[PDB]
Amino acid sequence: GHSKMSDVKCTSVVLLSVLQQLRVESSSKLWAQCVQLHNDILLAKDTTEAFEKMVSLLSVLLSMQGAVDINRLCEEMLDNRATLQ
């Protein structure tokens, strides 16, 4: 679809918990939509264009599934970005 496998081998429980907390399907892009987007923060161009991606997942998930822990991943991967700049 979009280039290749954006590293969808369940990196960090900080995504995964918040998906399995509801009803996520491995089979449905939704699983991967979070798993890969984590990396794509630290692998973003810059700071601003990193968290710009994460602020576009929490709203997509919580609309479909109403998760709670969705800010945990953000305040991890944003801070692991900021340490690099």
Side-chain angles (χ1 to χ4, degrees), residues 48-64:
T48 184
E49 204 178 277
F51 96 107
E52 272 273 299
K53 323 196 193 177
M54 77 183 71
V55 178
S56 283
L57 58 65
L58 75 183
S59 197
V60 78
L61 288 336
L62 267 52
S63 174
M64 96 95 175

Side-chain angles (χ1 to χ4, degrees), residues 66-78:
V68 280
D69 289 83
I70 206 70
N71 280 255
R72 275 85 204 82
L73 49 137
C74 298
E75 306 211 281
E76 191 164 299
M77 65 203 177
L78 186 48

